[PDB]
Design an enzyme around this catalytic site. Structure first.
Site, PDB file in Angstrom:
ATOM      1  N   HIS A   1     -10.964   9.375 -17.552  1.00 14.15           N
ATOM      2  CA  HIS A   1     -12.310   9.292 -17.425  1.00 14.15           C
ATOM      3  C   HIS A   1     -12.569  10.728 -16.591  1.00 14.15           C
ATOM      4  O   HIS A   1     -13.358  10.852 -15.529  1.00 14.15           O
ATOM      5  CB  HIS A   1     -12.713   8.157 -16.324  1.00 14.15           C
ATOM      6  CG  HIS A   1     -12.622   6.872 -16.894  1.00 14.15           C
ATOM      7  ND1 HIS A   1     -12.557   6.754 -18.448  1.00 14.15           N
ATOM      8  CD2 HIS A   1     -12.404   5.505 -16.306  1.00 14.15           C
ATOM      9  CE1 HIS A   1     -12.539   5.423 -18.785  1.00 14.15           C
ATOM     10  NE2 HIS A   1     -12.406   4.615 -17.631  1.00 14.15           N
TER      11      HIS A   1
ATOM     12  N   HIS B   1     -13.953  -2.100 -29.227  1.00 15.71           N
ATOM     13  CA  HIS B   1     -14.549  -1.026 -28.196  1.00 15.71           C
ATOM     14  C   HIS B   1     -14.478   0.346 -28.877  1.00 15.71           C
ATOM     15  O   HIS B   1     -13.739   0.801 -29.460  1.00 15.71           O
ATOM     16  CB  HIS B   1     -13.465  -1.135 -27.139  1.00 15.71           C
ATOM     17  CG  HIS B   1     -14.011  -0.388 -25.626  1.00 15.71           C
ATOM     18  ND1 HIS B   1     -15.181  -0.462 -25.510  1.00 15.71           N
ATOM     19  CD2 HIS B   1     -13.350   0.441 -24.994  1.00 15.71           C
ATOM     20  CE1 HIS B   1     -15.440   0.249 -24.356  1.00 15.71           C
ATOM     21  NE2 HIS B   1     -14.371   0.882 -24.217  1.00 15.71           N
TER      22      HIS B   1
ATOM     23  N   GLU C   1     -14.772   3.295 -27.273  1.00 15.34           N
ATOM     24  CA  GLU C   1     -14.679   4.218 -26.255  1.00 15.34           C
ATOM     25  C   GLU C   1     -13.566   5.652 -27.085  1.00 15.34           C
ATOM     26  O   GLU C   1     -12.743   4.962 -27.697  1.00 15.34           O
ATOM     27  CB  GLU C   1     -14.161   3.839 -24.935  1.00 15.34           C
ATOM     28  CG  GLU C   1     -14.043   5.017 -23.876  1.00 15.34           C
ATOM     29  CD  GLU C   1     -13.849   4.314 -22.460  1.00 15.34           C
ATOM     30  OE1 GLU C   1     -13.750   3.114 -22.415  1.00 15.34           O
ATOM     31  OE2 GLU C   1     -13.897   5.126 -21.559  1.00 15.34           O
TER      32      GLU C   1
ATOM     33  N   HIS D   1     -15.554  -3.664 -20.508  1.00 12.63           N
ATOM     34  CA  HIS D   1     -16.358  -3.140 -19.585  1.00 12.63           C
ATOM     35  C   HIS D   1     -17.813  -2.470 -20.219  1.00 12.63           C
ATOM     36  O   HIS D   1     -18.380  -1.734 -19.222  1.00 12.63           O
ATOM     37  CB  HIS D   1     -15.677  -2.085 -18.482  1.00 12.63           C
ATOM     38  CG  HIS D   1     -14.907  -0.975 -19.138  1.00 12.63           C
ATOM     39  ND1 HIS D   1     -15.735   0.083 -19.471  1.00 12.63           N
ATOM     40  CD2 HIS D   1     -13.784  -0.935 -19.785  1.00 12.63           C
ATOM     41  CE1 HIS D   1     -15.060   1.177 -20.054  1.00 12.63           C
ATOM     42  NE2 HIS D   1     -13.848   0.347 -20.288  1.00 12.63           N
TER      43      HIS D   1
ATOM     44  N   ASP E   1      -9.493  -3.581 -23.715  1.00 16.61           N
ATOM     45  CA  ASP E   1      -9.278  -3.003 -22.294  1.00 16.61           C
ATOM     46  C   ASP E   1      -8.742  -4.156 -21.460  1.00 16.61           C
ATOM     47  O   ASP E   1      -7.966  -4.109 -20.519  1.00 16.61           O
ATOM     48  CB  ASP E   1     -10.482  -2.284 -21.895  1.00 16.61           C
ATOM     49  CG  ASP E   1     -10.650  -0.992 -22.346  1.00 16.61           C
ATOM     50  OD1 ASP E   1      -9.718  -0.324 -22.627  1.00 16.61           O
ATOM     51  OD2 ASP E   1     -11.765  -0.303 -22.135  1.00 16.61           O
TER      52      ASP E   1
ATOM     53  N   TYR F   1      -5.780  -1.089 -12.435  1.00 19.00           N
ATOM     54  CA  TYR F   1      -6.875  -1.257 -13.402  1.00 19.00           C
ATOM     55  C   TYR F   1      -8.146  -1.781 -12.937  1.00 19.00           C
ATOM     56  O   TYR F   1      -9.014  -1.261 -13.265  1.00 19.00           O
ATOM     57  CB  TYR F   1      -6.189  -1.656 -14.761  1.00 19.00           C
ATOM     58  CG  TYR F   1      -7.077  -1.286 -15.992  1.00 19.00           C
ATOM     59  CD1 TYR F   1      -7.915  -2.359 -16.441  1.00 19.00           C
ATOM     60  CD2 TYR F   1      -7.312  -0.057 -16.574  1.00 19.00           C
ATOM     61  CE1 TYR F   1      -8.824  -2.170 -17.632  1.00 19.00           C
ATOM     62  CE2 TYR F   1      -7.666   0.212 -17.797  1.00 19.00           C
ATOM     63  CZ  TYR F   1      -8.616  -0.918 -18.161  1.00 19.00           C
ATOM     64  OH  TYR F   1      -9.458  -0.554 -19.556  1.00 19.00           O
TER      65      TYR F   1
ATOM     66  N   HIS G   1      -4.141  -1.072 -23.973  1.00 21.48           N
ATOM     67  CA  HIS G   1      -3.376  -0.250 -22.995  1.00 21.48           C
ATOM     68  C   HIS G   1      -2.090  -0.926 -22.561  1.00 21.48           C
ATOM     69  O   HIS G   1      -2.399  -2.290 -22.069  1.00 21.48           O
ATOM     70  CB  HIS G   1      -4.163   0.040 -21.813  1.00 21.48           C
ATOM     71  CG  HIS G   1      -5.379   1.093 -22.495  1.00 21.48           C
ATOM     72  ND1 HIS G   1      -5.096   2.315 -22.839  1.00 21.48           N
ATOM     73  CD2 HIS G   1      -6.738   0.875 -22.428  1.00 21.48           C
ATOM     74  CE1 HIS G   1      -6.203   3.124 -23.061  1.00 21.48           C
ATOM     75  NE2 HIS G   1      -7.101   2.094 -22.869  1.00 21.48           N
TER      76      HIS G   1
HETATM   77  C1  FMN Z   1     -16.185   4.125 -16.722  1.00 19.78           C
HETATM   78  C2  FMN Z   1     -17.415   4.414 -17.294  1.00 19.78           C
HETATM   79  C3  FMN Z   1     -18.709   3.798 -16.635  1.00 19.78           C
HETATM   80  C4  FMN Z   1     -19.942   4.013 -17.461  1.00 19.78           C
HETATM   81  N1  FMN Z   1     -21.132   3.675 -16.871  1.00 19.78           N
HETATM   82  C5  FMN Z   1     -22.301   3.873 -17.265  1.00 19.78           C
HETATM   83  C6  FMN Z   1     -23.383   3.287 -16.841  1.00 19.78           C
HETATM   84  O1  FMN Z   1     -23.522   2.946 -15.968  1.00 19.78           O
HETATM   85  N2  FMN Z   1     -24.725   3.439 -17.452  1.00 19.78           N
HETATM   86  C7  FMN Z   1     -24.708   4.151 -18.479  1.00 19.78           C
HETATM   87  O2  FMN Z   1     -25.924   4.315 -19.072  1.00 19.78           O
HETATM   88  N3  FMN Z   1     -23.521   4.709 -19.158  1.00 19.78           N
HETATM   89  C8  FMN Z   1     -22.413   4.442 -18.455  1.00 19.78           C
HETATM   90  N4  FMN Z   1     -21.149   4.989 -19.121  1.00 19.78           N
HETATM   91  C9  FMN Z   1     -21.397   5.518 -20.594  1.00 19.78           C
HETATM   92  C10 FMN Z   1     -21.347   7.374 -20.333  1.00 19.78           C
HETATM   93  O3  FMN Z   1     -22.484   7.644 -19.435  1.00 19.78           O
HETATM   94  C11 FMN Z   1     -21.297   7.747 -21.686  1.00 19.78           C
HETATM   95  O4  FMN Z   1     -19.912   7.882 -22.258  1.00 19.78           O
HETATM   96  C12 FMN Z   1     -21.649   9.382 -21.659  1.00 19.78           C
HETATM   97  O5  FMN Z   1     -22.450   9.806 -22.434  1.00 19.78           O
HETATM   98  C13 FMN Z   1     -20.394  10.406 -21.211  1.00 19.78           C
HETATM   99  O6  FMN Z   1     -20.554  11.270 -20.042  1.00 19.78           O
HETATM  100  P1  FMN Z   1     -19.667  12.602 -20.210  1.00 19.78           P
HETATM  101  O7  FMN Z   1     -20.609  13.880 -20.695  1.00 19.78           O
HETATM  102  O8  FMN Z   1     -19.084  12.787 -18.892  1.00 19.78           O
HETATM  103  O9  FMN Z   1     -18.801  12.423 -20.996  1.00 19.78           O
HETATM  104  C14 FMN Z   1     -20.026   4.730 -18.600  1.00 19.78           C
HETATM  105  C15 FMN Z   1     -18.865   5.119 -19.184  1.00 19.78           C
HETATM  106  C16 FMN Z   1     -17.732   5.105 -18.552  1.00 19.78           C
HETATM  107  C17 FMN Z   1     -16.460   5.539 -19.304  1.00 19.78           C
HETATM  108 FE    FE Z   2     -12.824   1.467 -22.068  1.00 18.04          FE
HETATM  109 FE    FE Z   3      -9.525   1.872 -22.823  1.00 11.05          FE
HETATM  110  O     O Z   4     -11.289   2.085 -22.875  1.00 12.44           O
END
Ligand code: FMN
Ligand code: FE
Ligand code: FE
Ligand code: O
Ligand code: FMN
Ligand code: FE
Ligand code: FE
Ligand code: O
Lengths: 400, 400
Positions: B22, B78, B80, B146, B165, B193, B226
């Site tokens: 992240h 997922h 991601e 998540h 996850d 985690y 993972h």
């Molecule tokens: C741990 C985590 C928490 C996130 N929480 C939110 C959230 O609360 N609201 C939202 O709209 N997107 C959330 N996202 C999605 C990210 O905002 C999205 O992937 C974003 O486009 C990536 O931002 P970056 O420019 O840092 O890569 C979350 C993503 C991650 C990995």
């Molecule tokens: Fe994830």
């Molecule tokens: Fe993951």
């Molecule tokens: O993930």
């Protein structure tokens, strides 16, 4: 020791290894120094000391220069640990020696050392101290520059202004004078110092400098507590302070951000292009707050006319490093600057609006925000590039 | 590849070097892994992929295991980047292959890859997919666990729950199963985690696990995305999740802070002693946020019944690292925890009250603050030690 001028001897300490100041909030990449001075006329006066860790070296080196019992007066322009840290070590050998300082200095000196039994002499602006041979010290109160206890000491005859922190910089060199060091490196450290330390007190800098200049006192040298001693056109650092204090800004835009998957980064790069192709006059800097030096970021922000701050939404909030840096800028109190928040989100987002509000709280005049979902495609990058266009046209210092 | 069970083959990727997840908000100190699975019955099904940087290795290794044209279905639990990052690389060779996923997954998959022309198949809880030989996949929607697109896939007959996850951990090892690795290191990464990732969604964990258990489906193995594959008493990680989700807390107090001259640090050490001598049952951990690991701090906070956060006043505000960490805790949404702010100041202060308010905003039940001026003397340290006494008596889980 090194002779500064006539009977003035430098008895400070160079710190080549030092990299962290104020904990870890100020990175000293080119080391630093702690300037202490020993004036030897009819009377012997020690001006400030050094860091606590170099206390044993300071007292020993001082012994080799003069008998500790022959020291008449001790002057503390500033009671921060990097200047008065070795005070306790010294007073253990000569506890009866008088200490000249501001009223606030007694509170700060006692606050660190807890030796109120010491013989303090409260001084105020205009107060003088005879050292013999027709020479005397003149004290000038400079509260909130950058501490409530801060003051300067002027030596008549030799025309030397001991300014402590003021006009100083964290730059370590074997040579003592400004005309003996690298000018570019010297300027970078001086600007780096003001932007990170003295920015919030800019409203007090101009009036205080005006007051000192009003005294019509000759200035041959400016001996600070950090870095070089200004002897060749010493008033040059004072002029920079006048410019820097007047809500200084260049035709420059600083963009910094934090990112988890580079989505926000791609927005930043797109914004920069839109700006560069709209206004070639503007200089653009981009930093990842997680991969960049925090102090270099703040130095550019100080130099910039406006900034764009990017963040992705993480758990309905902004990224910690971005939140932390915004908190810091709020303390620096930048003035006459504009700001625009941007960033990517996953679903509901909310971090961008959150960040924009805190930037306004920090004192920035806020423009519209820029938002994107996930990774920006070709159509999205056009908007980001367009946002840079809108920002460039708005933040234009001059037409076209 | 490695045989997981019968016709189930592990075709993932181990990452020994990985240290940042992240961005830089999750430090993977023991590396990590990205589990992908290939089921070969009458039909051939690929479950998830791997990181984008290992896309070339993933597709090549997959070729050596099976002809890419013989792959019938692709499942994305997922979307991601660390699980579906190599999707674009794979779809370039077999663009006609169907992709089974949640409705939200299409938004997230397209958001990253921008290939909406792919053949998506929206699935919901209860949906089944026959793979032959009397076996079939059962899909279970797990939104906000998540991510909004998150889901699990259950394989009948073999009784294998692909949880992605969920129940996973960032732990790299040459051995694949939980009974083949270091148990202590495994537990640390599992708790690390959940505390850093799944804490804010704890209210959704219990009901979802209850729902899955309600299906009365046999669970022989739990293959996450993972770390290890749970085969020996695989339901043990599920039980921990039930405990961790119930506003988990031990008889433990976590103290962390930032400091420029150690004044606040001396307060923290004094507070800890006052607590330890009042309640021996409580375990105490102390961290300098500038010198400690952020994720270890958050793991202890998750385990703690309450915390004490310290900060000195810097430019009328709190220290950036403290402000940043508080911002992060607000997103994690800890529940049923108590907090007490402390710290040192120079003259006017104000950072302590500022911090205390934001801790309350983060969801902590706030106790009285503790303040000191400059460096605490013997009398001040008694108060700090006394503050620990007052905190220990208040936050006592049981009498005495
Ligand atoms: C741990 C985590 C928490 C996130 N929480 C939110 C959230 O609360 N609201 C939202 O709209 N997107 C959330 N996202 C999605 C990210 O905002 C999205 O992937 C974003 O486009 C990536 O931002 P970056 O420019 O840092 O890569 C979350 C993503 C991650 C990995
Ligand atoms: Fe994830
Ligand atoms: Fe993951
Ligand atoms: O993930
Ligand atoms: C750069 C700097 C800024 C400061 N700003 C303030 C301030 O705004 N208000 C205040 O009361 N004290 C201020 N102080 C004084 C410190 O809070 C004081 O030295 C404190 O006791 C040290 O905290 P520590 O525990 O981190 O060493 C400042 C000190 C420094 C070095
Ligand atoms: Fe200072
Ligand atoms: Fe200094
Ligand atoms: O200082």
């Amino acid at each position: 020791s090194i002779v500064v001028k006539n009977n003035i001897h430098w008895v400070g300490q160079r710190d080549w290894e030092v990299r962290d100041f104020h904990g870890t909030e100020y990175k000293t990449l080119r080391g630093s120094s702690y300037n202490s001075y020993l004036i030897r006329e009819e009377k012997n006066v020690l001006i400030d000391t050094v860091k606590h860790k170099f206390s044993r070296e300071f007292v020993q080196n001082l012994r080799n220069e003069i008998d500790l019992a022959d020291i008449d007066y001790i002057v503390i322009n500033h009671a921060e640990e990097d200047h008065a840290g070795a005070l306790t070590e010294l007073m253990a050998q000569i506890p009866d020696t008088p200490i000249y300082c501001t009223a606030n200095a007694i509170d700060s000196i006692n606050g660190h050392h807890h030796h109120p039994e010491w013989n303090f002499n409260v001084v105020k602006t205009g107060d003088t101290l005879d050292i013999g041979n027709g020479k005397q010290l003149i004290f000038v109160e400079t509260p909130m520059l950058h501490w409530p206890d801060s003051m300067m000491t002027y030596l008549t005859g030799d025309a030397v202004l001991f300014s402590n922190d003021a006009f100083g910089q964290h730059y370590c060199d074997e040579h003592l004078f400004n005309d003996e060091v690298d000018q570019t490196e010297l300027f970078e450290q001086c600007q780096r110092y003001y932007a990170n330390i003295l920015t919030p007190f800019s409203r007090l800098v101009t009036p205080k400098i005006t007051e000192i200049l009003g005294f019509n006192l000759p200035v041959d040298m400016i001996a600070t507590s950090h870095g070089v001693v200004w002897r060749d056109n010493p008033t040059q650092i004072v002029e920079l302070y006048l410019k820097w204090a007047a809500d200084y800004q260049e035709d420059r835009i600083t963009i910094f951000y934090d990112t988890m998957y580079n989505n926000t980064r791609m927005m930043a790069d797109a914004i920069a292009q839109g700006i560069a192709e709209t206004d070639p006059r503007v200089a653009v800097k981009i930093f990842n707050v997680a991969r960049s030096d925090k102090n270099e970021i703040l130095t550019n922000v100080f130099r910039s006319k406006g900034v764009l701050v990017g963040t992705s939404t993480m758990n309905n909030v902004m990224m910690p490093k971005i939140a932390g840096l915004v908190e810091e800028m709020t303390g620096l109190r930048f003035r006459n600057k504009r700001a625009s928040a941007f960033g990517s989100h996953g679903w509901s987002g909310g971090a961008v609006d959150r960040l924009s509000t805190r930037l306004q709280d920090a004192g920035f005049e806020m423009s519209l925000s820029l938002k994107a979902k996930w990774r920006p495609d070709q159509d999205a990058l056009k908007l980001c590039r367009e946002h840079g266009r809108e920002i460039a046209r708005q933040w234009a210092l001059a037409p076209l």
